[PDB]
Amino acid sequence: REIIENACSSAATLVALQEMRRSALGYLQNDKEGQEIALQYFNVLISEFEGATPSNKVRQGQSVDQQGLELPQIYFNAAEARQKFVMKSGMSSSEKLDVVKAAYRQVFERDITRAYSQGISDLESKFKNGEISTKEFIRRLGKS
Amino acid sequence: TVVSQVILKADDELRYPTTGELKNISDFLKTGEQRLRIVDTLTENEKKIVDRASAQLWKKRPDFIAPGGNAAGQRERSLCLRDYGWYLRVITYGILSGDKDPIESIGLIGVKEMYNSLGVPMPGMVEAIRCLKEASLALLDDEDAKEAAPYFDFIIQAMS
Amino acid sequence: RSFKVTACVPSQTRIRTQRELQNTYFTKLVPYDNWFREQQRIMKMGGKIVKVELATGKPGTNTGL
Amino acid sequence: SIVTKSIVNADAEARYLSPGELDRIKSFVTSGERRVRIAETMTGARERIIKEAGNQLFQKRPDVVSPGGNAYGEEMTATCLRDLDYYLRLITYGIVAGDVTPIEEIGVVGVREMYKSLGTPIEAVAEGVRAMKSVATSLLSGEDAAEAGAYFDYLIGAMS
Amino acid sequence: SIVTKSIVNADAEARYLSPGELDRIKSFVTSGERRVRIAETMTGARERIIKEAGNQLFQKRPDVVSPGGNAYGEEMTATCLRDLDYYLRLITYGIVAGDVTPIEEIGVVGVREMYKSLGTPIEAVAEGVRAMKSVATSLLSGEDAAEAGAYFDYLIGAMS
Amino acid sequence: GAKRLEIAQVLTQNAELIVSRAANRIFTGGSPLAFLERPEE
Amino acid sequence: MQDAITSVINSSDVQGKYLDASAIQKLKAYFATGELRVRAATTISANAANIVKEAVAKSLLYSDITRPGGNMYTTRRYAACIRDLDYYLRYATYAMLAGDPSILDERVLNGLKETYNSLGVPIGATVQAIQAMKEVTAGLVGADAGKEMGIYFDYICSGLS
Amino acid sequence: MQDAITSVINSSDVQGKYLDASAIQKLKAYFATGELRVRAATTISANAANIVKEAVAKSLLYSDITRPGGNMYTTRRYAACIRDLDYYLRYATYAMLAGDPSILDERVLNGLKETYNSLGVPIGATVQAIQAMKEVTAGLVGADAGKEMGIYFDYICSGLS
Amino acid sequence: MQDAITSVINSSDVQGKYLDASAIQKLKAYFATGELRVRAATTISANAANIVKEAVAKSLLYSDITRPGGNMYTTRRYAACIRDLDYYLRYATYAMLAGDPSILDERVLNGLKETYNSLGVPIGATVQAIQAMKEVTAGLVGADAGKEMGIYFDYICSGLS
Amino acid sequence: MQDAITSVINSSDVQGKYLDASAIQKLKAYFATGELRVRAATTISANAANIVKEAVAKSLLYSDITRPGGNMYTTRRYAACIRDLDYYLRYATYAMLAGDPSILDERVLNGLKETYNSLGVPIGATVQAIQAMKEVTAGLVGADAGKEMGIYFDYICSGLS
Amino acid sequence: ALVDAMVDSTEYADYFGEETVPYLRGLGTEAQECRNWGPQIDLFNYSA
Amino acid sequence: MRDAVTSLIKNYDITGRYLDRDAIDSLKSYFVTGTARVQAAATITANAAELVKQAASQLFGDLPELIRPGGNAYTTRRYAACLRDMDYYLRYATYALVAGDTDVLDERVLQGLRETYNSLGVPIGPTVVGIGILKDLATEKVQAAGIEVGAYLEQPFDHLISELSETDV
Numbered sequence A: 001r002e003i004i005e006n007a008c009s010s011a012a013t014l015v016a017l018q019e020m021r022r023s024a025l026g027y028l029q030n031d032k033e034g035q036e037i038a039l040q041y042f043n044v045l046i047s048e049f050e051g052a053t054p055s056n057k058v059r060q061g062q063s064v065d066q067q068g069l070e071l072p073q074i075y076f077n078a079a080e081a082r083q084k085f086v087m088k089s090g091m092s093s094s095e096k097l098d099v100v101k102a103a104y105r106q107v108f109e110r111d112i113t114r115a116y117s118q119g120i121s122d123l124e125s126k127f128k129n130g131e132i133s134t135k136e137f138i139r140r141l142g143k144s
Numbered sequence B: 001t002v003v004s005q006v007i008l009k010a011d012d013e014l015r016y017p018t019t020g021e022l023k024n025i026s027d028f029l030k031t032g033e034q035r036l037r038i039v040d041t042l043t044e045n046e047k048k049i050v051d052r053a054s055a056q057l058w059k060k061r062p063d064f065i066a067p068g069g070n071a072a073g074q075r076e077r078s079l080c081l082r083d084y085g086w087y088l089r090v091i092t093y094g095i096l097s098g099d100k101d102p103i104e105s106i107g108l109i110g111v112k113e114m115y116n117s118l119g120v121p122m123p124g125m126v127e128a129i130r131c132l133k134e135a136s137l138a139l140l141d142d143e144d145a146k147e148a149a150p151y152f153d154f155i156i157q158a159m160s
Numbered sequence C: 001r002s003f004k005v006t007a008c009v010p011s012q013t014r015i016r017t018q019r020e021l022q023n024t025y026f027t028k029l030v031p032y033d034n035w036f037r038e039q040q041r042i043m044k045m046g047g048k049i050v051k052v053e054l055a056t057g058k059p060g061t062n063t064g065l
Numbered sequence D, E: 001s002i003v004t005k006s007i008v009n010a011d012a013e014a015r016y017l018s019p020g021e022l023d024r025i026k027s028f029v030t031s032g033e034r035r036v037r038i039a040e041t042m043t044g045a046r047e048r049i050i051k052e053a054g055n056q057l058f059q060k061r062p063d064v065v066s067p068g069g070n071a072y073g074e075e076m077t078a079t080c081l082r083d084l085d086y087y088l089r090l091i092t093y094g095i096v097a098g099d100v101t102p103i104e105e106i107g108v109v110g111v112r113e114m115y116k117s118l119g120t121p122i123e124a125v126a127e128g129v130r131a132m133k134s135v136a137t138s139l140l141s142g143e144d145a146a147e148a149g150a151y152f153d154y155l156i157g158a159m160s
Numbered sequence F: 001g002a003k004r005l006e007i008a009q010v011l012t013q014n015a016e017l018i019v020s021r022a023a024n025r026i027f028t029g030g031s032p033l034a035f036l037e038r039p040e041e
Numbered sequence G, H, I, J: 001m002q003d004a005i006t007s008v009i010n011s012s013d014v015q016g017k018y019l020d021a022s023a024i025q026k027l028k029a030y031f032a033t034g035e036l037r038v039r040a041a042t043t044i045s046a047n048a049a050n051i052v053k054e055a056v057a058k059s060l061l062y063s064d065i066t067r068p069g070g071n072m073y074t075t076r077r078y079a080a081c082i083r084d085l086d087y088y089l090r091y092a093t094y095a096m097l098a099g100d101p102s103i104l105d106e107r108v109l110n111g112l113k114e115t116y117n118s119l120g121v122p123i124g125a126t127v128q129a130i131q132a133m134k135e136v137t138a139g140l141v142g143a144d145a146g147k148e149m150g151i152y153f154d155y156i157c158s159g160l161s
Numbered sequence K: 001a002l003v004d005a006m007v008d009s010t011e012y013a014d015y016f017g018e019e020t021v022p023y024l025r026g027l028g029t030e031a032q033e034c035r036n037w038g039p040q041i042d043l044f045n046y047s048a
Numbered sequence L: 001m002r003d004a005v006t007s008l009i010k011n012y013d014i015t016g017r018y019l020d021r022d023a024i025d026s027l028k029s030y031f032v033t034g035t036a037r038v039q040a041a042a043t044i045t046a047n048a049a050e051l052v053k054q055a056a057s058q059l060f061g062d063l064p065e066l067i068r069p070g071g072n073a074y075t076t077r078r079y080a081a082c083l084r085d086m087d088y089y090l091r092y093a094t095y096a097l098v099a100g101d102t103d104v105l106d107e108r109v110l111q112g113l114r115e116t117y118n119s120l121g122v123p124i125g126p127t128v129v130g131i132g133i134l135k136d137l138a139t140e141k142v143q144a145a146g147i148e149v150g151a152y153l154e155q156p157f158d159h160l161i162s163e164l165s166e167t168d169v
């Protein structure tokens, strides 16, 4: 909408897409089951066009020579997200265990607990306590 | 200002500021009384500016005053007239500091999406600052018009 | 030698980069050799160190890490 | 230079060129004719500076010249005047650039590891460039000797 | 539960739950009455099938009841039936929960190293649960056996 | 997915009519669907 | 963490017994109310950029907090108080589909009591913000779900006290 | 990080008013002393291995502390002690360049008072070494700028004690 | 990564038209064969230990590759050469459910020629090991979806040799 | 390329001096053993199919490097391997006759360690072959000239390992 | 010291921070540079 | 990155010489245009967020073979990414305009750009037209701003053309 704000009318698009929705759900009056599916889906098309753009997410070089860049919020939202495994303190144990699965998977490139049956077990206990943070669990793994 | 560009630039490289920026610090600090010719002539001529630009906006784009718009009620229009002099306040922070560091961290970081949290759209409010520039630069003298013109010009790029 | 620290470190970039915010005011053992680089890193983000307490280490040795 | 340092800082935040660094650069480039007629007079009198600071060093540090010191012998004390010939030659690159990134990338960042590997005392160079400063301020006029003398004073801080 | 895996997948992505995966909760609670009837028919029928399938493990592993075996006497075999009956609640815990992790957080996290202590083999305790899932599938119907039996051969694979 | 194909199998043959329902409220002077540059077979 | 399905599983586990007749009726109450919660959570989806708007307009705007000297005066601090309000809605629908207060004791409340005093955020407007968020969605999604939505809304503001 | 320029920006912004006369009398005082502070920051950085040497050779060498028994006997304690005195001087010059001690409040005096009692570091000796480093610095830069470091050298000593 | 959904949409989208009736017939076949292979994917995922134990015994045991001089002689390489075979079983579940073997070519077949030659493992022994798994996956599943497995399954061993 | 006379010229050419009395005894030690090396080469060439026969008979034959699971096994790779062992002996005749190992470092040791990893033939068997070639040769020629032939044998073995 | 100089960097704590695991930042998750576009995805492969 | 001053430093450093008469007159030739460099760089960033918007609408009205479903500018996922990937060419042209030479363009934007676009399927062809539309649409706002114009400010741009585009002749 903020692309076509100069050429097209923003008010003409909302009234066109609403009656595009209303005439399409009038075609689905017979099945009685998919009409509420497309009413959920056309309402995404109306409500996403209601808002304006979000801003561009921007990376910054903390080194002075590495250049800063920019990325559209669209382009990050379309690609899949890497599963960020945050570990907080009092979470449950199975949800605690797949974090320390993935911490080995990040550093040692594969799950060497599952595949080689080895990994230092005293460090996980300080990790699962909430004693050391996840920054420290990487660093004491890196000096091992 | 220039001094917080240098200390935050010399802390992570763990070194004293060298002469390439110490000459750059001292060159800003001899231009205060030149910059103070610009900062009060914006100050006492504030209310002459604040509705000469506000009439300039709605004669250019009347939809914020049109019924169903944004400042169609008076409690929104009293808010929106306030935000001009708020923007005239923080621009004059920048001309005093001679840099971006007040004009970043007060009224510019994150405004592209938090007008969208409100009702006000983005690019009409870009037109509000652009008419506020010519409402101020006509009041300014010409040889110091070109100094204060990039500080108004940054707000056009960062908001759109 | 290692000592725990309570510190609250806001980021001042999560408005720009639009990341998932992790909730600070943590407690962690930082070792003695790695601490002042990590302490200076709390100052670069402007976070405020609340409490530093010596966990283990017996302050005053000449040998013994 | 300063123009690299203003771009590289503005590239890291990924914005355009600010009104801050538009005026650091413009104030640099209207001082560009002033710094080259500073830096010519160093190169115009390079045989006098090296001879006078060579006369000024060896009376301050006679452990160097005396045998068993490093610069002992007519081939070795000719190299220590050549060892100071480079640092006078580098300072003229720093005066023209307006910063010390010619000094940093060429003559600073590995000095203490090199001069430990050569046998010379490191602080004895830091007296010599300081003695090289004391004949360079007698060349120029007063308002320029504060500018060119700061580039000498940066090089002392790299050594000691 | 199957809510809990779908909640923490959305949080580790920091993503809102998409309506293409909200059907797995809607199809759960339609079958949530149906899954309780699986645990309802394993409620009153539990009290027969544990005593039978203990004998089937003794046919497959006669070294257990041998002198020098790990379950020799009365009370070594009396708790070993009770050590099997611990698992029978867990598969009925996972039917109503609908998924893996209530079996996992109670029974299968440390099972490879706790039976390593007291000497009962993992390759002995597995096929008694295969003896369990044979007779538990006998009381079920055709559709009930494929759903409830799917939790068993996970745990058989989780032993071996 | 068998239901989800049937929603598309009602909309694909009705999409040529549904723009003529849509564009006729926002456009006045010309019978617009004929102006549609549809992708040819 | 623990679902209301699994909370009866964990409490019967430390009881050590089978799923008895008291365990059915608690589990049947979640399954009889399971289709409300997915119907509740599917319409926070299309209004996730809208419920945050008027709740700010009901309890936060036209006040001293957006004035100079107020804590969300500058637009960096305005952007976080819509960001930190957007996360409190998204994590509260996780409590809706769980049917527990326990998803939110430790994903949310584990550091908020000390961060807001360290950052100088006044808690006394945040409780008014979530209570503004409680009234708007009950008139949005329906009365029966908004009764269920307001329960875990009360866990996060009393948990912020 | 608050420059004395940016400090009176922030104290004017919390009221939301423009720059008054008494605020400008802080700027035009600060714009007057610009060339003085730049001359001091050059000659410290050319002497920053000698200001840190003549402070410790005056006050701390041949004392209790360099002798065996307390706190500077081993070389790793001596390397850590000259690491602090270099870092105090490098952080004092920023407050001389800013004209505000907010660098010292943010980057130096955060964890330092707690970590010295937690390490057994004598505060009463290192409050003297910065006190000994003042009159070296007041002689090395000239007493006009020597009365400028004395605010920010003893802002450390006001905080660390 | 990609999908049979992405293969039918982007083939229609770069043409720019709507869904073809021949493009429907791919998806009408695709949603029909779900329940004939979703139930196959549960049986494959359950018996992952019994498949790999059988398939390494049908083709790789008691040979020169197990004996010294071979590449499965140490136990570190033998444990890897189970999990290197286990990932091809797991990624064959992915290309069965996605309906498209383009999950394999740039996630599991991408660096597969590079790691195997840099360690020098016989690629001709892997394909003999992988084609041994086609027999054991048919008896656990059935002849209907054993055909449906083996199309995506032989795409691994085609790109290896 | 160069020999014991050309090198001691080229050692004394790049200094700029003439042939001094410190380099003539490098020639006189060569010319004293000049008649010894020419009798050493003329028994190598008369036995050159038997030195390569007795070398592989102690290391490679009847092992399992010539097994069907082996490197040697196809007779294309056998006749190369005798010939790849021919070229180690024939140049070792040359360097003994030259008195300098420079002809070994140009043509034999050109890229030989990096060809062998690119081919897959083992290096640890090749050092076992030439050190079996060394003990056959010194028995055949004589314990004087087998010592100087043993240097140029092991100079190849220093380059392979 | 190398793992000390990288985990304590401000490049680390800005992005990952304190209580999350490191994750590799491929294309799409953030903007990616053009100078090292070649050997970054080649480094992100398992054949690294 | 590497200024016209600092390029003349290691044009003279590697041969080990001082600053002679040719060094003192080539560097003065840079400084007499430095007032014209900076004021052109202000008015390029006068409407730089508008200047990419006027260029790409003039691009895509000229080459529709990039709007209709063909080459990748199809969705707003591509189009708003296209406006960002256009905006780097405007923003880095500001830096080398001030820096004198094109060595900022040489190792920030040009290196890898033949290899980034080939990995995505982004064509190099209309990117050259996109800088070629920004070639003259930058000179308009310098001309309407009263700055003189010339090789400086019309060069950074064809160094993004003659080195990015592949050589035909």
Ligand SMILES: *[C@H](C)[C@H]1/C(=C/c2[nH]c(/C=C3N=C(/C=C4\NC(=O)C(CC)=C4C)C(C)=C\3CCC(=O)O)c(CCC(=O)O)c2C)NC(=O)[C@@H]1C
Residues within 6 Å of the ligand: A003, A004, A007, A008, A009, A012, A013, L057, L060, L067, L074, L075, L076, L077, L079
């Ligand atoms: C105005 C009443 C009508 C209208 C006109 C219009 N649109 C454009 C430009 C574009 N339209 C798109 C459209 C989409 N992008 C998408 O991702 C989707 C969902 C699949 C759609 C529908 C895009 C990318 C552009 C920009 C590229 C282009 O030029 O086409 C114009 C041209 C604007 C200009 O001159 O710069 C006009 C006149 N758009 C509407 O929505 C109304 C139907």
Ligand SMILES: *[C@H](C)[C@H]1/C(=C/c2[nH]c(/C=C3N=C(/C=C4\NC(=O)C(CC)=C4C)C(C)=C\3CCC(=O)O)c(CCC(=O)O)c2C)NC(=O)[C@@H]1C
Residues within 6 Å of the ligand: C032, C033, C035, C036, C039, C040, C059, C060, C061, H060, H065, H070, H071, H072, H076, H077, H078, H080, H081, H082, H083, H084, H085, H087, H088, H091, H107, H108, H112, H115, H119, H121, H122, H123, H125, H126, H129
């Ligand atoms: C010096 C004359 C006095 C002294 C110094 C001393 N300090 C330490 C240890 C530390 N010092 C610091 C200092 C800082 N951290 C900061 O952020 C700043 C602001 C820039 C400063 C000045 C820290 C963090 C430590 C602990 C970590 C470390 O490894 O250094 C020691 C070492 C103590 C030991 O037992 O090894 C010493 C000796 N102590 C004295 O005796 C003098 C009074």
Ligand SMILES: *[C@H](C)[C@H]1/C(=C/c2[nH]c(/C=C3N=C(/C=C4\NC(=O)C(CC)=C4C)C(C)=C\3CCC(=O)O)c(CCC(=O)O)c2C)NC(=O)[C@@H]1C
Residues within 6 Å of the ligand: I057, I060, I061, I062, I063, I066, I072, I073, I074, I075, I078
């Ligand atoms: C005997 C003491 C125990 C026992 C042994 C047993 N092993 C197998 C099968 C194999 N054993 C190996 C052994 C090794 N591989 C290694 O890398 C090392 C270290 C160098 C060893 C010891 C291997 C590779 C196999 C697979 C068959 C093969 O060699 O190709 C069996 C047969 C199992 C089968 O399925 O055939 C048995 C019975 N079992 C016991 O009861 C003893 C305790």
Ligand SMILES: *[C@H](C)[C@H]1/C(=C/c2[nH]c(/C=C3N=C(/C=C4\NC(=O)C(CC)=C4C)C(C)=C\3CCC(=O)O)c(CCC(=O)O)c2C)NC(=O)[C@@H]1C
Residues within 6 Å of the ligand: A069, A070, A071, K027, K028, K030, K031, K032, K033, K034, K035, L056, L066, L071, L072, L073, L077, L078, L079, L081, L082, L083, L085, L086, L088, L108, L109, L110, L113, L116, L120, L122, L123, L126, L127, L130
């Ligand atoms: C738009 C007018 C043109 C076009 C653009 C287009 N670009 C992309 C993607 C990228 N462009 C870059 C380029 C750079 N990154 C840099 O760091 C630098 C130096 C500062 C440059 C020049 C990169 C890395 C990408 C990849 C995405 C990312 O930024 O991380 C796309 C997206 C491709 C897609 O379909 O997904 C598009 C559309 N394409 C055109 O057709 C126009 C010619």
Ligand SMILES: CCC1=C(C)/C(=C/C2=NC(=C\c3[nH]c(/C=C4\NC(=O)[C@H](C)[C@H]4CC)c(C)c3CCC(=O)O)/C(CCC(=O)O)=C2C)NC1=O
Residues within 6 Å of the ligand: B063, B064, B065, B070, B071, B076, B077, B079, B080, B081, B083, B084, B086, B087, B106, B107, B118, B119, B120, B124, B125, B126, B128, G061, G062, G066, G072, G073, G074, G075, G078
């Ligand atoms: C310190 C930096 C900063 C500023 C200046 C700021 C302003 C600001 N402007 C607002 C609203 C507004 N802003 C506008 C403005 C406009 N509509 C148009 O058509 C015009 C283009 C533009 C006219 C100037 C209007 C009409 C409202 C009222 C909308 C509403 O609150 O419902 C609001 C919400 C309600 C209010 O307080 O009035 C804030 C907080 N916020 C900040 O953080």
Ligand SMILES: CCC1=C(C)/C(=C/C2=NC(=C\c3[nH]c(/C=C4\NC(=O)[C@H](C)[C@H]4CC)c(C)c3CCC(=O)O)/C(CCC(=O)O)=C2C)NC1=O
Residues within 6 Å of the ligand: E057, E064, E070, E071, E076, E077, E079, E080, E081, E082, E083, E084, E086, E087, E090, E106, E107, E111, E118, E120, E121, E124, E125, E128
């Ligand atoms: C669900 C979580 C859970 C696990 C994993 C568990 C294991 C478990 N098995 C035990 C005993 C035992 N379990 C067995 C079991 C067997 N011996 C055999 O040969 C058979 C193969 C097999 C069972 C069919 C035996 C012999 C003992 C007694 C061990 C001893 O006293 O030496 C005991 C000690 C007595 C008891 O409290 O029951 C525990 C705690 N209990 C649990 O609650």
Ligand SMILES: CCC1=C(C)/C(=C/C2=NC(=C\c3[nH]c(/C=C4\NC(=O)[C@H](C)[C@H]4CC)c(C)c3CCC(=O)O)/C(CCC(=O)O)=C2C)NC1=O
Residues within 6 Å of the ligand: C010, C011, C012, C014, C021, C022, C023, C024, G065, G070, G071, G072, G073, G076, G077, G078, G080, G081, G084, G085, G087, G088, G091, G107, G108, G109, G112, G115, G119, G121, G122, G123, G125, G126, G129
């Ligand atoms: C998902 C669970 C969760 C929550 C809720 C959460 C909140 C959270 N809100 C924060 C800040 C903030 N919160 C506010 C909020 C407010 N200011 C006001 O004026 C109002 C009174 C109020 C809201 C109504 C502001 C202004 C900041 C920024 C503080 C600063 O930047 O100095 C911060 C500090 C770092 C940051 O700025 O992001 C956290 C961690 N984090 C979490 O992990």
Ligand SMILES: CCC1=C(C)/C(=C/C2=NC(=C\c3[nH]c(/C=C4\NC(=O)[C@H](C)[C@H]4CC)c(C)c3CCC(=O)O)/C(CCC(=O)O)=C2C)NC1=O
Residues within 6 Å of the ligand: H060, H061, H062, H063, H065, H066, H067, H068, H072, H073, H074, H075, H078
């Ligand atoms: C057990 C470990 C240990 C070490 C390493 C140590 C070094 C040490 N050497 C010192 C002084 C000194 N050390 C020297 C020694 C030398 N300079 C020369 O020219 C000689 C060749 C050379 C002898 C190797 C000198 C001359 C001083 C006095 C420096 C001065 O007063 O300026 C001092 C300062 C006075 C004090 O407080 O003790 C310390 C701490 N002290 C210790 O307790």
Ligand SMILES: CCC1=C(C)/C(=C/C2=NC(=C\c3[nH]c(/C=C4\NC(=O)[C@H](C)[C@H]4CC)c(C)c3CCC(=O)O)/C(CCC(=O)O)=C2C)NC1=O
Residues within 6 Å of the ligand: I060, I065, I071, I072, I076, I077, I078, I080, I081, I082, I083, I084, I085, I087, I088, I107, I108, I109, I111, I115, I119, I121, I122, I125, I126, I129, I130, K045, K046, K047
């Ligand atoms: C997700 C895509 C992907 C996969 C699957 C993958 C596998 C992979 N297989 C490996 C090794 C291996 N793979 C084998 C495999 C075999 N040996 C045989 O003789 C059999 C014929 C064959 C099994 C079919 C062996 C022996 C090794 C160990 C080589 C070594 O580490 O020395 C390694 C070596 C690193 C290590 O030592 O852990 C990796 C990374 N890498 C990937 O990036």
Ligand SMILES: CCC1=C(C)/C(=C/C2=NC(=C\c3[nH]c(/C=C4\NC(=O)[C@H](C)[C@H]4CC)c(C)c3CCC(=O)O)/C(CCC(=O)O)=C2C)NC1=O
Residues within 6 Å of the ligand: J065, J071, J072, J076, J077, J078, J080, J081, J082, J084, J087, J088, J091, J107, J108, J109, J110, J112, J115, J119, J121, J122, J125, J126, J129
């Ligand atoms: C003097 C200059 C010179 C060198 C360096 C030379 C080296 C040489 N040795 C080679 C091969 C070879 N090298 C060996 C190695 C051996 N034979 C064995 O069986 C043992 C395992 C081992 C030594 C004890 C083998 C088996 C081949 C043939 C490899 C093959 O055909 O695949 C090859 C590859 C030729 C080919 O295979 O077509 C070259 C170029 N030829 C030369 O003229």
